[PDB]
Amino acid sequence: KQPISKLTRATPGSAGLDLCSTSHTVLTPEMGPQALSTGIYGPLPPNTFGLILGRSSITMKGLQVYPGVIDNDYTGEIKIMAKAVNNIVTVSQGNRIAQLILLPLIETDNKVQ
Amino acid sequence: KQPISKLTRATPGSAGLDLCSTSHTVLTPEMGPQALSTGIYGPLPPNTFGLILGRSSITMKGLQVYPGVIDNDYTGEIKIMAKAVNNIVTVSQGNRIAQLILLPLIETDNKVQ
Amino acid sequence: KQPISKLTRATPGSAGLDLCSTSHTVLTPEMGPQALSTGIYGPLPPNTFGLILGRSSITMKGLQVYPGVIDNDYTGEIKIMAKAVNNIVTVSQGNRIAQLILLPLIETDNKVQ
Numbered sequence A, B, C: 001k002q003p004i005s006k007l008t009r010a011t012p013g014s015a016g017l018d019l020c021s022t023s024h025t026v027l028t029p030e031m032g033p034q035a036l037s038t039g040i041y042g043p044l045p046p047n048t049f050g051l052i053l054g055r056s057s058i059t060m061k062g063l064q065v066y067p068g069v070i071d072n073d074y075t076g077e078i079k080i081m082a083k084a085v086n087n088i089v090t091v092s093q094g095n096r097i098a099q100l101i102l103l104p105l106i107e108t109d110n111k112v113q
């Protein structure tokens, strides 16, 4: 397992930490949502949670990443939920296919139930 | 009407407050976006706004929630904008179908026009 | 080029800064993702990044905006990545078709590589 501290940012001012596919995968529109492996695991830094979002160059190529929430205390593998929009999409091993955004986790008194 | 203070978090470290459907609803891909009732209303805590996002177990089952912005001063009912991706999806009353994330509302000098 | 300081908020408590299409554009579902021009450019205020999200009245009319990340130091034109969901969608010049949300940019020690 690899922690999110192993992820890289494309540039200093990049909001997102890039997530790469660990598998070669072909996706077609009739397959609907697929969960792609990253080999990266939570959890996240204190007082933060994560959002997985598409990379724009990838979205424009017809692979939709559904926005996903990563909980602060998730310790499982971060997966990318993805769907081929219109056409056949081929993901290669190591391709940067999404990005992780870190956001402040606001405390509230909502019941934890 | 029920305020967002009535929502619950799945776990202490869960970023999202779960939103449940108040109706049994069937959705098909040809129907396109539908707005599901929650019986939960704004507004939000001071200096925050909301994002409605999908729950991953729900997205993976073929129901797409379109990300939606909840304004700090919205006092209407929070609705979930949803679409069946490929297949027929049946939502039952009380099913947790999305989640509300709270985020800091940044002040800017943009004209309010 | 116009900076994001030229954007307007619908109301004082609106989280989003509205983005308008500068072109008349027709979109069909078979066209897949299209990048709509706004004539608005980064960069963003210090310590912030942006998210482009749909407006709910627009999403409900069948035009999906794919959530997009605007980096703090992006100096290019902000484009809206959009797709007609089920039907033919006609965007007119000046129509508010998405919104820009500003969010705090969290610093981490991830390699910038």
Ligand SMILES: O=c1ccn([C@H]2C[C@H](O)[C@@H](COP(=O)(O)NP(=O)(O)OP(=O)(O)O)O2)c(=O)[nH]1
Residues within 6 Å of the ligand: A052, A066, A067, A068, A069, A070, A071, A072, A074, A077, A078, A079, A080, A081, B010, B014, B016, B054, B055, B056, B057, B058
């Ligand atoms: O894109 C995603 C979304 C979620 N996840 C993981 C991390 C997150 O903390 C965990 C739970 O996410 P959600 O709350 O969105 N899913 P759901 O509500 O279906 O499961 P749970 O009841 O555990 O909260 O799933 C991913 O790996 N990728």
Ligand SMILES: O=c1ccn([C@H]2C[C@H](O)[C@@H](COP(=O)(O)NP(=O)(O)OP(=O)(O)O)O2)c(=O)[nH]1
Residues within 6 Å of the ligand: B052, B066, B067, B068, B069, B070, B071, B072, B074, B077, B078, B079, B080, B081, C010, C014, C016, C054, C055, C056, C057, C058
């Ligand atoms: O998923 C959503 C998105 C928005 N909303 C409500 C809350 C939000 O404050 C209100 C307005 O949202 P948008 O600005 O996204 N919609 P639009 O720009 O079409 O309407 P307005 O001109 O009032 O801002 O709609 C929901 O209930 N669910």
Ligand SMILES: O=c1ccn([C@H]2C[C@H](O)[C@@H](COP(=O)(O)NP(=O)(O)OP(=O)(O)O)O2)c(=O)[nH]1
Residues within 6 Å of the ligand: A010, A014, A016, A054, A055, A056, A057, A058, C052, C066, C067, C068, C069, C070, C071, C072, C074, C077, C078, C079, C080, C081
């Ligand atoms: O909806 C969007 C998304 C991104 N963008 C622009 C701004 C953002 O800073 C820039 C890069 O975005 P991403 O990182 O999402 N794209 P990608 O990873 O494909 O390109 P790069 O390798 O440059 O980061 O693209 C838009 O104009 N609209």
Ligand SMILES: [Mg+2]
Residues within 6 Å of the ligand: A010, A014, A016, A055, A099
């Ligand atoms: Mg990028």
Ligand SMILES: [Mg+2]
Residues within 6 Å of the ligand: B010, B014, B016, B055, B099
């Ligand atoms: Mg959950």
Ligand SMILES: [Mg+2]
Residues within 6 Å of the ligand: C010, C014, C016, C055, C099
């Ligand atoms: Mg609006």
